[PDB]
Amino acid sequence: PFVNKQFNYKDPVNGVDIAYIKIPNAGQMQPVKAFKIHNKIWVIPERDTFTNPEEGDLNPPPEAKQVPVSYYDSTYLSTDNEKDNYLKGVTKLFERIYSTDLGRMLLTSIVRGIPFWGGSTIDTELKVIDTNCINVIQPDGSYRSEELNLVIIGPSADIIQFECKSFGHEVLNLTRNGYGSTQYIRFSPDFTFGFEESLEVDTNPLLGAGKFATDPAVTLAHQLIHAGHRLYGIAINPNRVFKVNTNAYYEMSGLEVSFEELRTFGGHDAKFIDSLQENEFRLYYYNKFKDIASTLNKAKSIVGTTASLQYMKNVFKEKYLLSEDTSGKFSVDKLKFDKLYKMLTEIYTEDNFVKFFKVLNAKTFLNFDKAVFKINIVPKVNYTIYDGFNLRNTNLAANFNGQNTEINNMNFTKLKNFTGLFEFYKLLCVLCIKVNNWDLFFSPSEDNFTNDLNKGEEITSSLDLIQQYYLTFNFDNEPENISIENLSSDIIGQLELMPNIERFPNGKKYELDKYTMFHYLRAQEFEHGKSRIALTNSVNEALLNPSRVYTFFSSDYVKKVNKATEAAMFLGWVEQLVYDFTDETSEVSTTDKIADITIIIPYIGPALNIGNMLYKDDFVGALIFSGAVILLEFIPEIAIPVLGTFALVSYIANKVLTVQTIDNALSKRNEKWDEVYKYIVTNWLAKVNTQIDLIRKKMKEALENQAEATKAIINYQYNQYTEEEKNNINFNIDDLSSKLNESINKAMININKFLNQCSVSYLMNSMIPYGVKRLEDFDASLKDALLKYIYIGQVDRLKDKVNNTLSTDIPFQLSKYVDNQRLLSTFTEY
């Protein structure tokens, strides 16, 4: 196990594994008790008031942070019992992460990744940096400095803001120049992020309603991935922000997401960056690693400890995986460094940890949080090492009911979040309404996507991979805690300076002439008023009178819900309403007049007002007329310029050299096809898939709103009765709620199928042909050039080979480019 001996906040100070410590700070701080849990890893069950002098208070600031959920409470982690609970939770979380294979990989890598000793001015001498060592005070009083790699401190006033911190150098960027530094992780195991999800309906038709609770193991794995990245000095510069346009009303106010976040999240999240930027980052960090190798080569002396040159040379060689030769020449081998970079960049990702834990979690960042939950995971009756919340041999093992906040009510408590539901907003009007900042579309800018297609080019002559990496990994030896000369009494250090993020303006007003989908979504909202709720089809009426609620069903539904009947036929009323709702939500129209669109669901038309046009049948007509363009709020700007014509190098009288040139030309032709396909797929994912995802989520929200509205109407009607009638009927609205939610799911599968078909048909009809035209022109410009190039020996055979190869376009295989069950499933039938 990771934690060898158990720790509690009552053990008297020892001086080896438990001790009062002092960490670097700008001023002077008092010693704080700390528990070492493994080699080079310590924990401080105290609130973060030491590393950040600016964060010297645990009270809510007047300006709320730009985070969808934030819980503030100064009382937490102030009592001894709370500290013991925190220590137990952290130990259990570390054990759970160490249980899995990928977690063991990550923990071994983090323990191995000791920072670099580049604090010396002499070009041939290595000296430890003060900002990477901490002091431990023995009971007698004589403190001793020690190295370390990780520190866990209870979060700051923002109790769920889990952001890694570090102490940098005056002129060096230790987090991105390959030097590395110890990472202080603000982690809290007693709180979790409670979000909603509806993508598991296909695999779990009996998926429960409500939100879901994120496993804290995933959050700790994310923070640990960030710490491991910053330990190896491969983090991306923070100014590389994923810029998003904010001028449009349908555009976000701002989403400060770094490229490091994209790299850490993994999965589809890692596909928002093009291959060019990834290659640039890889080459830049390769240059940094070779610089580090040269620095190791030129260094001859160690000052600060008794450790010899050989031991530290071996330690840093294991840290950076450098190919040192017989003469001690450390070189950055391309293959080993590439494997290490791939492992740290793509293997160590949140998506892989979600797959390994077998827990429900968000796939992209766009489905922001909605609640914060207080949890206790110290007792085994609530959370176990192996399975987590989804305990085995219970009713919570299947369908991920253990992580449900409505089924596992005993383990979760909904706390108050400080960020108001309409605290950050935009004012849209044509009745100026307030639309939440986190409910808006994600619009990437055109600058974030860069390509080298127009540049010329010259011709010369899954879990399986994780298992293989485990079989090829080593867990034999970890770096030792070598004695080091004591540092100063106070470690003077300053946190790494972060780039300033300008406050996004709040309450920007937009004047329009058409009804946005947000207006229609808001028109289907009520306030649980005691007065009778009336359904209507005019969105203007719903948005003016808050008692009225807009509905996109037929007039029969409105008539049926707007009538009045005594308790004699209410028993019939309930079943008629549930049957009509199930019928209308499950309605479908089949057509073949639009390519790749076999389902043309009409009621989407007036629900989200996608077509800017009232009639649903006219929406059917508009869809079969104009393809999947109507769904997208803003048409993405896809532009493939003229491809770089190949430059084959002539080789006179060397026939086999000519053959190698003609083979490399074909290979790079296929690779160019694949790369253009990948670029277009990335554009489709970034600019179109997010819009369809938001439309799907908003349609689910609208359906749930309609169900809640009709449920409120029937509840109000039932409340109007007498007590004897209520007892005789015994109308249990929970059963009807479950029935209507199941009808919502039965409609949701069809809605998912339709939207998946539309989002794949847009790629097949309006994005791929643009590239295919360019590459067909490229083939036309290449075949004649190659024919000129061949003008001795096997002339005829070469001509047949080239004509056969460039006669047909390479087939588009969506499987190799995007890995998702729904998209592949809908692409299969065509």
PDB file of N, CA, C and O in Angstrom, residues 89 92-97 99-100 162 187-195 197 211-223 350 353-362 369 373 375-377 382-391 396 400 402-405 408 411-412:
ATOM      1  N   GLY A  89      -9.362  10.845   4.838  1.00  0.00           N
ATOM      2  CA  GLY A  89      -9.867  10.905   3.477  1.00  0.00           C
ATOM      3  C   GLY A  89      -8.758  10.982   2.447  1.00  0.00           C
ATOM      4  O   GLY A  89      -8.817  10.320   1.409  1.00  0.00           O
ATOM      5  N   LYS A  92      -7.127   7.545   2.181  1.00  0.00           N
ATOM      6  CA  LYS A  92      -7.971   6.608   1.447  1.00  0.00           C
ATOM      7  C   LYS A  92      -7.986   6.923  -0.045  1.00  0.00           C
ATOM      8  O   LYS A  92      -7.973   6.008  -0.877  1.00  0.00           O
ATOM      9  N   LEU A  93      -8.019   8.208  -0.403  1.00  0.00           N
ATOM     10  CA  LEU A  93      -7.982   8.587  -1.813  1.00  0.00           C
ATOM     11  C   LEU A  93      -6.671   8.166  -2.464  1.00  0.00           C
ATOM     12  O   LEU A  93      -6.662   7.657  -3.593  1.00  0.00           O
ATOM     13  N   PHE A  94      -5.552   8.378  -1.768  1.00  0.00           N
ATOM     14  CA  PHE A  94      -4.263   7.962  -2.305  1.00  0.00           C
ATOM     15  C   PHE A  94      -4.202   6.449  -2.471  1.00  0.00           C
ATOM     16  O   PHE A  94      -3.685   5.948  -3.476  1.00  0.00           O
ATOM     17  N   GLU A  95      -4.735   5.705  -1.497  1.00  0.00           N
ATOM     18  CA  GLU A  95      -4.784   4.251  -1.615  1.00  0.00           C
ATOM     19  C   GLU A  95      -5.627   3.818  -2.809  1.00  0.00           C
ATOM     20  O   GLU A  95      -5.239   2.914  -3.559  1.00  0.00           O
ATOM     21  N   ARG A  96      -6.787   4.452  -3.000  1.00  0.00           N
ATOM     22  CA  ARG A  96      -7.654   4.096  -4.118  1.00  0.00           C
ATOM     23  C   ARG A  96      -6.977   4.373  -5.453  1.00  0.00           C
ATOM     24  O   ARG A  96      -7.070   3.563  -6.383  1.00  0.00           O
ATOM     25  N   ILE A  97      -6.298   5.515  -5.573  1.00  0.00           N
ATOM     26  CA  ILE A  97      -5.597   5.820  -6.817  1.00  0.00           C
ATOM     27  C   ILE A  97      -4.454   4.837  -7.041  1.00  0.00           C
ATOM     28  O   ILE A  97      -4.242   4.356  -8.162  1.00  0.00           O
ATOM     29  N   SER A  99      -4.416   1.841  -6.142  1.00  0.00           N
ATOM     30  CA  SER A  99      -4.956   0.517  -6.432  1.00  0.00           C
ATOM     31  C   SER A  99      -4.966   0.241  -7.932  1.00  0.00           C
ATOM     32  O   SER A  99      -4.598  -0.852  -8.376  1.00  0.00           O
ATOM     33  N   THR A 100      -5.383   1.223  -8.726  1.00  0.00           N
ATOM     34  CA  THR A 100      -5.473   1.035 -10.167  1.00  0.00           C
ATOM     35  C   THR A 100      -4.087   1.047 -10.809  1.00  0.00           C
ATOM     36  O   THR A 100      -3.105   1.525 -10.235  1.00  0.00           O
ATOM     37  N   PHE A 162      -9.525  23.758  -6.744  1.00  0.00           N
ATOM     38  CA  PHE A 162      -8.355  22.898  -6.585  1.00  0.00           C
ATOM     39  C   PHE A 162      -7.343  23.289  -7.657  1.00  0.00           C
ATOM     40  O   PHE A 162      -7.339  22.750  -8.764  1.00  0.00           O
ATOM     41  N   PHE A 187      -6.183  20.389  -2.166  1.00  0.00           N
ATOM     42  CA  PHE A 187      -7.102  19.276  -2.346  1.00  0.00           C
ATOM     43  C   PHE A 187      -8.002  19.133  -1.127  1.00  0.00           C
ATOM     44  O   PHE A 187      -7.569  19.357   0.008  1.00  0.00           O
ATOM     45  N   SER A 188      -9.257  18.758  -1.370  1.00  0.00           N
ATOM     46  CA  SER A 188     -10.233  18.542  -0.309  1.00  0.00           C
ATOM     47  C   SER A 188     -11.066  17.304  -0.618  1.00  0.00           C
ATOM     48  O   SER A 188     -11.840  17.302  -1.583  1.00  0.00           O
ATOM     49  N   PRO A 189     -10.941  16.234   0.174  1.00  0.00           N
ATOM     50  CA  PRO A 189     -11.672  14.998  -0.132  1.00  0.00           C
ATOM     51  C   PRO A 189     -13.102  14.971   0.381  1.00  0.00           C
ATOM     52  O   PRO A 189     -13.884  14.126  -0.075  1.00  0.00           O
ATOM     53  N   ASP A 190     -13.475  15.862   1.295  1.00  0.00           N
ATOM     54  CA  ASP A 190     -14.802  15.842   1.896  1.00  0.00           C
ATOM     55  C   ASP A 190     -15.852  16.555   1.054  1.00  0.00           C
ATOM     56  O   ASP A 190     -17.019  16.600   1.456  1.00  0.00           O
ATOM     57  N   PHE A 191     -15.473  17.109  -0.095  1.00  0.00           N
ATOM     58  CA  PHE A 191     -16.400  17.812  -0.969  1.00  0.00           C
ATOM     59  C   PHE A 191     -16.261  17.279  -2.386  1.00  0.00           C
ATOM     60  O   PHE A 191     -15.192  16.808  -2.786  1.00  0.00           O
ATOM     61  N   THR A 192     -17.351  17.357  -3.147  1.00  0.00           N
ATOM     62  CA  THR A 192     -17.354  16.824  -4.500  1.00  0.00           C
ATOM     63  C   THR A 192     -18.255  17.672  -5.386  1.00  0.00           C
ATOM     64  O   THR A 192     -19.090  18.445  -4.907  1.00  0.00           O
ATOM     65  N   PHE A 193     -18.072  17.505  -6.693  1.00  0.00           N
ATOM     66  CA  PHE A 193     -18.730  18.317  -7.708  1.00  0.00           C
ATOM     67  C   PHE A 193     -19.925  17.534  -8.242  1.00  0.00           C
ATOM     68  O   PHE A 193     -19.750  16.456  -8.819  1.00  0.00           O
ATOM     69  N   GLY A 194     -21.134  18.065  -8.057  1.00  0.00           N
ATOM     70  CA  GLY A 194     -22.334  17.365  -8.477  1.00  0.00           C
ATOM     71  C   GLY A 194     -22.935  17.908  -9.756  1.00  0.00           C
ATOM     72  O   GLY A 194     -23.479  19.020  -9.778  1.00  0.00           O
ATOM     73  N   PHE A 195     -22.851  17.119 -10.826  1.00  0.00           N
ATOM     74  CA  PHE A 195     -23.207  17.529 -12.177  1.00  0.00           C
ATOM     75  C   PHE A 195     -24.306  16.631 -12.733  1.00  0.00           C
ATOM     76  O   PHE A 195     -24.627  15.580 -12.176  1.00  0.00           O
ATOM     77  N   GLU A 197     -25.964  14.526 -16.193  1.00  0.00           N
ATOM     78  CA  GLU A 197     -25.542  13.786 -17.375  1.00  0.00           C
ATOM     79  C   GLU A 197     -26.735  13.021 -17.932  1.00  0.00           C
ATOM     80  O   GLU A 197     -27.538  12.476 -17.170  1.00  0.00           O
ATOM     81  N   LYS A 211     -29.027  14.851 -10.648  1.00  0.00           N
ATOM     82  CA  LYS A 211     -27.627  15.065 -10.981  1.00  0.00           C
ATOM     83  C   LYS A 211     -26.818  13.809 -10.658  1.00  0.00           C
ATOM     84  O   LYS A 211     -27.363  12.764 -10.293  1.00  0.00           O
ATOM     85  N   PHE A 212     -25.498  13.904 -10.797  1.00  0.00           N
ATOM     86  CA  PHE A 212     -24.578  12.837 -10.435  1.00  0.00           C
ATOM     87  C   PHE A 212     -23.418  13.431  -9.651  1.00  0.00           C
ATOM     88  O   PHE A 212     -23.088  14.610  -9.802  1.00  0.00           O
ATOM     89  N   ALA A 213     -22.795  12.604  -8.816  1.00  0.00           N
ATOM     90  CA  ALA A 213     -21.694  13.038  -7.967  1.00  0.00           C
ATOM     91  C   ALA A 213     -20.371  12.557  -8.547  1.00  0.00           C
ATOM     92  O   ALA A 213     -20.199  11.361  -8.807  1.00  0.00           O
ATOM     93  N   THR A 214     -19.443  13.489  -8.746  1.00  0.00           N
ATOM     94  CA  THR A 214     -18.128  13.142  -9.265  1.00  0.00           C
ATOM     95  C   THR A 214     -17.314  12.422  -8.197  1.00  0.00           C
ATOM     96  O   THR A 214     -17.268  12.852  -7.040  1.00  0.00           O
ATOM     97  N   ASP A 215     -16.680  11.326  -8.584  1.00  0.00           N
ATOM     98  CA  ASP A 215     -15.797  10.616  -7.669  1.00  0.00           C
ATOM     99  C   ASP A 215     -14.597  11.498  -7.341  1.00  0.00           C
ATOM    100  O   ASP A 215     -13.935  11.997  -8.258  1.00  0.00           O
ATOM    101  N   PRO A 216     -14.290  11.723  -6.060  1.00  0.00           N
ATOM    102  CA  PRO A 216     -13.101  12.525  -5.724  1.00  0.00           C
ATOM    103  C   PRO A 216     -11.802  11.906  -6.204  1.00  0.00           C
ATOM    104  O   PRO A 216     -10.799  12.622  -6.321  1.00  0.00           O
ATOM    105  N   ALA A 217     -11.787  10.599  -6.479  1.00  0.00           N
ATOM    106  CA  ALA A 217     -10.591   9.975  -7.032  1.00  0.00           C
ATOM    107  C   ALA A 217     -10.229  10.581  -8.379  1.00  0.00           C
ATOM    108  O   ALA A 217      -9.049  10.794  -8.674  1.00  0.00           O
ATOM    109  N   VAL A 218     -11.233  10.877  -9.208  1.00  0.00           N
ATOM    110  CA  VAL A 218     -10.971  11.495 -10.506  1.00  0.00           C
ATOM    111  C   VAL A 218     -10.376  12.886 -10.329  1.00  0.00           C
ATOM    112  O   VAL A 218      -9.438  13.271 -11.037  1.00  0.00           O
ATOM    113  N   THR A 219     -10.920  13.670  -9.394  1.00  0.00           N
ATOM    114  CA  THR A 219     -10.389  15.009  -9.154  1.00  0.00           C
ATOM    115  C   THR A 219      -8.951  14.953  -8.652  1.00  0.00           C
ATOM    116  O   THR A 219      -8.093  15.729  -9.099  1.00  0.00           O
ATOM    117  N   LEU A 220      -8.667  14.038  -7.722  1.00  0.00           N
ATOM    118  CA  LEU A 220      -7.301  13.900  -7.230  1.00  0.00           C
ATOM    119  C   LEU A 220      -6.369  13.432  -8.340  1.00  0.00           C
ATOM    120  O   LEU A 220      -5.214  13.862  -8.406  1.00  0.00           O
ATOM    121  N   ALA A 221      -6.856  12.562  -9.228  1.00  0.00           N
ATOM    122  CA  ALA A 221      -6.049  12.129 -10.363  1.00  0.00           C
ATOM    123  C   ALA A 221      -5.761  13.284 -11.312  1.00  0.00           C
ATOM    124  O   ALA A 221      -4.660  13.382 -11.861  1.00  0.00           O
ATOM    125  N   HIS A 222      -6.741  14.162 -11.527  1.00  0.00           N
ATOM    126  CA  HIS A 222      -6.526  15.339 -12.368  1.00  0.00           C
ATOM    127  C   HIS A 222      -5.465  16.253 -11.766  1.00  0.00           C
ATOM    128  O   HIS A 222      -4.531  16.692 -12.455  1.00  0.00           O
ATOM    129  N   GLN A 223      -5.593  16.549 -10.471  1.00  0.00           N
ATOM    130  CA  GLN A 223      -4.603  17.396  -9.811  1.00  0.00           C
ATOM    131  C   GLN A 223      -3.230  16.739  -9.813  1.00  0.00           C
ATOM    132  O   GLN A 223      -2.206  17.415  -9.961  1.00  0.00           O
ATOM    133  N   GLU A 350      -7.374  12.444 -17.654  1.00  0.00           N
ATOM    134  CA  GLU A 350      -8.546  12.242 -16.808  1.00  0.00           C
ATOM    135  C   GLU A 350      -9.495  11.212 -17.411  1.00  0.00           C
ATOM    136  O   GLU A 350     -10.136  10.451 -16.678  1.00  0.00           O
ATOM    137  N   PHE A 353      -8.468   7.727 -16.496  1.00  0.00           N
ATOM    138  CA  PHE A 353      -8.797   7.436 -15.105  1.00  0.00           C
ATOM    139  C   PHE A 353     -10.290   7.194 -14.928  1.00  0.00           C
ATOM    140  O   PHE A 353     -10.696   6.350 -14.122  1.00  0.00           O
ATOM    141  N   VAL A 354     -11.124   7.930 -15.666  1.00  0.00           N
ATOM    142  CA  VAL A 354     -12.563   7.688 -15.625  1.00  0.00           C
ATOM    143  C   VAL A 354     -12.876   6.291 -16.143  1.00  0.00           C
ATOM    144  O   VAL A 354     -13.707   5.572 -15.574  1.00  0.00           O
ATOM    145  N   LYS A 355     -12.213   5.885 -17.228  1.00  0.00           N
ATOM    146  CA  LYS A 355     -12.410   4.538 -17.756  1.00  0.00           C
ATOM    147  C   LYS A 355     -11.973   3.478 -16.750  1.00  0.00           C
ATOM    148  O   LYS A 355     -12.661   2.467 -16.566  1.00  0.00           O
ATOM    149  N   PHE A 356     -10.832   3.691 -16.092  1.00  0.00           N
ATOM    150  CA  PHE A 356     -10.313   2.686 -15.168  1.00  0.00           C
ATOM    151  C   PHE A 356     -11.172   2.580 -13.913  1.00  0.00           C
ATOM    152  O   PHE A 356     -11.441   1.473 -13.431  1.00  0.00           O
ATOM    153  N   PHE A 357     -11.607   3.717 -13.366  1.00  0.00           N
ATOM    154  CA  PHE A 357     -12.446   3.698 -12.172  1.00  0.00           C
ATOM    155  C   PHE A 357     -13.836   3.145 -12.449  1.00  0.00           C
ATOM    156  O   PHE A 357     -14.516   2.722 -11.507  1.00  0.00           O
ATOM    157  N   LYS A 358     -14.268   3.139 -13.711  1.00  0.00           N
ATOM    158  CA  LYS A 358     -15.625   2.753 -14.093  1.00  0.00           C
ATOM    159  C   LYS A 358     -16.657   3.589 -13.332  1.00  0.00           C
ATOM    160  O   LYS A 358     -17.522   3.073 -12.623  1.00  0.00           O
ATOM    161  N   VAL A 359     -16.538   4.906 -13.492  1.00  0.00           N
ATOM    162  CA  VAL A 359     -17.428   5.863 -12.851  1.00  0.00           C
ATOM    163  C   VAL A 359     -17.955   6.822 -13.908  1.00  0.00           C
ATOM    164  O   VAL A 359     -17.350   7.017 -14.964  1.00  0.00           O
ATOM    165  N   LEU A 360     -19.103   7.423 -13.609  1.00  0.00           N
ATOM    166  CA  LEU A 360     -19.720   8.372 -14.523  1.00  0.00           C
ATOM    167  C   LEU A 360     -19.103   9.751 -14.333  1.00  0.00           C
ATOM    168  O   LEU A 360     -19.026  10.257 -13.210  1.00  0.00           O
ATOM    169  N   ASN A 361     -18.663  10.356 -15.433  1.00  0.00           N
ATOM    170  CA  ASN A 361     -18.013  11.655 -15.375  1.00  0.00           C
ATOM    171  C   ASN A 361     -18.251  12.389 -16.686  1.00  0.00           C
ATOM    172  O   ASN A 361     -18.576  11.785 -17.711  1.00  0.00           O
ATOM    173  N   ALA A 362     -18.089  13.709 -16.634  1.00  0.00           N
ATOM    174  CA  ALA A 362     -18.249  14.536 -17.820  1.00  0.00           C
ATOM    175  C   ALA A 362     -17.155  14.233 -18.836  1.00  0.00           C
ATOM    176  O   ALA A 362     -16.013  13.936 -18.475  1.00  0.00           O
ATOM    177  N   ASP A 369     -20.561  22.419 -13.856  1.00  0.00           N
ATOM    178  CA  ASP A 369     -21.180  21.884 -12.659  1.00  0.00           C
ATOM    179  C   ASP A 369     -22.489  22.603 -12.354  1.00  0.00           C
ATOM    180  O   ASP A 369     -22.788  23.674 -12.890  1.00  0.00           O
ATOM    181  N   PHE A 373     -21.410  19.016  -3.226  1.00  0.00           N
ATOM    182  CA  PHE A 373     -21.932  18.033  -2.287  1.00  0.00           C
ATOM    183  C   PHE A 373     -20.908  17.761  -1.196  1.00  0.00           C
ATOM    184  O   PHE A 373     -19.730  17.529  -1.487  1.00  0.00           O
ATOM    185  N   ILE A 375     -19.495  15.229   1.393  1.00  0.00           N
ATOM    186  CA  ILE A 375     -19.452  13.778   1.483  1.00  0.00           C
ATOM    187  C   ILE A 375     -18.495  13.371   2.595  1.00  0.00           C
ATOM    188  O   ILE A 375     -17.603  14.123   2.992  1.00  0.00           O
ATOM    189  N   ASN A 376     -18.707  12.160   3.106  1.00  0.00           N
ATOM    190  CA  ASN A 376     -17.810  11.536   4.070  1.00  0.00           C
ATOM    191  C   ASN A 376     -17.398  10.186   3.509  1.00  0.00           C
ATOM    192  O   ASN A 376     -18.256   9.360   3.183  1.00  0.00           O
ATOM    193  N   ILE A 377     -16.091   9.963   3.396  1.00  0.00           N
ATOM    194  CA  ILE A 377     -15.577   8.783   2.713  1.00  0.00           C
ATOM    195  C   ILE A 377     -14.564   8.069   3.595  1.00  0.00           C
ATOM    196  O   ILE A 377     -13.795   7.224   3.120  1.00  0.00           O
ATOM    197  N   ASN A 382     -19.586   3.861   3.350  1.00  0.00           N
ATOM    198  CA  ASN A 382     -19.918   4.885   2.371  1.00  0.00           C
ATOM    199  C   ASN A 382     -19.016   4.888   1.149  1.00  0.00           C
ATOM    200  O   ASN A 382     -19.445   5.343   0.087  1.00  0.00           O
ATOM    201  N   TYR A 383     -17.787   4.392   1.265  1.00  0.00           N
ATOM    202  CA  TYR A 383     -16.812   4.507   0.184  1.00  0.00           C
ATOM    203  C   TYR A 383     -15.697   3.512   0.454  1.00  0.00           C
ATOM    204  O   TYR A 383     -15.095   3.542   1.532  1.00  0.00           O
ATOM    205  N   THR A 384     -15.418   2.644  -0.511  1.00  0.00           N
ATOM    206  CA  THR A 384     -14.412   1.607  -0.347  1.00  0.00           C
ATOM    207  C   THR A 384     -13.227   1.865  -1.269  1.00  0.00           C
ATOM    208  O   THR A 384     -13.310   2.634  -2.231  1.00  0.00           O
ATOM    209  N   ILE A 385     -12.109   1.214  -0.945  1.00  0.00           N
ATOM    210  CA  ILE A 385     -10.867   1.433  -1.682  1.00  0.00           C
ATOM    211  C   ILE A 385     -11.007   0.961  -3.124  1.00  0.00           C
ATOM    212  O   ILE A 385     -10.603   1.653  -4.066  1.00  0.00           O
ATOM    213  N   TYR A 386     -11.592  -0.220  -3.319  1.00  0.00           N
ATOM    214  CA  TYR A 386     -11.560  -0.857  -4.632  1.00  0.00           C
ATOM    215  C   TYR A 386     -12.614  -0.285  -5.575  1.00  0.00           C
ATOM    216  O   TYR A 386     -12.301   0.091  -6.710  1.00  0.00           O
ATOM    217  N   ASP A 387     -13.866  -0.212  -5.126  1.00  0.00           N
ATOM    218  CA  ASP A 387     -14.972   0.145  -6.005  1.00  0.00           C
ATOM    219  C   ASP A 387     -15.413   1.598  -5.889  1.00  0.00           C
ATOM    220  O   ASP A 387     -16.072   2.099  -6.805  1.00  0.00           O
ATOM    221  N   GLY A 388     -15.074   2.283  -4.801  1.00  0.00           N
ATOM    222  CA  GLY A 388     -15.541   3.645  -4.627  1.00  0.00           C
ATOM    223  C   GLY A 388     -16.994   3.693  -4.180  1.00  0.00           C
ATOM    224  O   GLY A 388     -17.453   2.873  -3.383  1.00  0.00           O
ATOM    225  N   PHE A 389     -17.724   4.681  -4.705  1.00  0.00           N
ATOM    226  CA  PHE A 389     -19.130   4.828  -4.343  1.00  0.00           C
ATOM    227  C   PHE A 389     -19.958   3.632  -4.794  1.00  0.00           C
ATOM    228  O   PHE A 389     -20.852   3.188  -4.065  1.00  0.00           O
ATOM    229  N   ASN A 390     -19.681   3.100  -5.984  1.00  0.00           N
ATOM    230  CA  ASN A 390     -20.437   1.972  -6.529  1.00  0.00           C
ATOM    231  C   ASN A 390     -20.008   0.685  -5.821  1.00  0.00           C
ATOM    232  O   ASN A 390     -19.264  -0.145  -6.347  1.00  0.00           O
ATOM    233  N   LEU A 391     -20.500   0.536  -4.593  1.00  0.00           N
ATOM    234  CA  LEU A 391     -20.164  -0.627  -3.785  1.00  0.00           C
ATOM    235  C   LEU A 391     -20.705  -1.901  -4.427  1.00  0.00           C
ATOM    236  O   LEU A 391     -21.753  -1.901  -5.077  1.00  0.00           O
ATOM    237  N   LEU A 396     -26.543  -0.353  -5.560  1.00  0.00           N
ATOM    238  CA  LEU A 396     -25.813   0.759  -6.152  1.00  0.00           C
ATOM    239  C   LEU A 396     -24.689   0.308  -7.073  1.00  0.00           C
ATOM    240  O   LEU A 396     -23.978   1.158  -7.621  1.00  0.00           O
ATOM    241  N   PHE A 400     -24.711   2.733 -12.076  1.00  0.00           N
ATOM    242  CA  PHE A 400     -24.059   3.838 -11.373  1.00  0.00           C
ATOM    243  C   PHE A 400     -25.042   4.575 -10.465  1.00  0.00           C
ATOM    244  O   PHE A 400     -25.087   5.806 -10.417  1.00  0.00           O
ATOM    245  N   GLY A 402     -24.809   4.367  -7.264  1.00  0.00           N
ATOM    246  CA  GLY A 402     -24.045   4.823  -6.117  1.00  0.00           C
ATOM    247  C   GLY A 402     -23.645   6.281  -6.202  1.00  0.00           C
ATOM    248  O   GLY A 402     -23.583   6.973  -5.183  1.00  0.00           O
ATOM    249  N   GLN A 403     -23.371   6.768  -7.408  1.00  0.00           N
ATOM    250  CA  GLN A 403     -22.986   8.156  -7.617  1.00  0.00           C
ATOM    251  C   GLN A 403     -24.179   9.067  -7.865  1.00  0.00           C
ATOM    252  O   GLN A 403     -23.988  10.266  -8.089  1.00  0.00           O
ATOM    253  N   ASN A 404     -25.396   8.532  -7.830  1.00  0.00           N
ATOM    254  CA  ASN A 404     -26.589   9.345  -8.006  1.00  0.00           C
ATOM    255  C   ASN A 404     -26.884  10.121  -6.729  1.00  0.00           C
ATOM    256  O   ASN A 404     -26.790   9.584  -5.622  1.00  0.00           O
ATOM    257  N   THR A 405     -27.239  11.395  -6.889  1.00  0.00           N
ATOM    258  CA  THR A 405     -27.572  12.243  -5.754  1.00  0.00           C
ATOM    259  C   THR A 405     -29.033  12.139  -5.340  1.00  0.00           C
ATOM    260  O   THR A 405     -29.413  12.726  -4.321  1.00  0.00           O
ATOM    261  N   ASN A 408     -28.769   7.662  -3.860  1.00  0.00           N
ATOM    262  CA  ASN A 408     -27.883   7.566  -2.701  1.00  0.00           C
ATOM    263  C   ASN A 408     -27.953   8.853  -1.878  1.00  0.00           C
ATOM    264  O   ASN A 408     -26.963   9.548  -1.655  1.00  0.00           O
ATOM    265  N   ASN A 411     -25.704   9.570   1.447  1.00  0.00           N
ATOM    266  CA  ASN A 411     -24.276   9.851   1.390  1.00  0.00           C
ATOM    267  C   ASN A 411     -23.948  11.248   0.885  1.00  0.00           C
ATOM    268  O   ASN A 411     -22.787  11.662   0.976  1.00  0.00           O
ATOM    269  N   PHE A 412     -24.927  11.985   0.367  1.00  0.00           N
ATOM    270  CA  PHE A 412     -24.686  13.296  -0.213  1.00  0.00           C
ATOM    271  C   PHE A 412     -25.611  14.325   0.418  1.00  0.00           C
ATOM    272  O   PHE A 412     -26.758  14.027   0.762  1.00  0.00           O
TER     273      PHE A 412
END
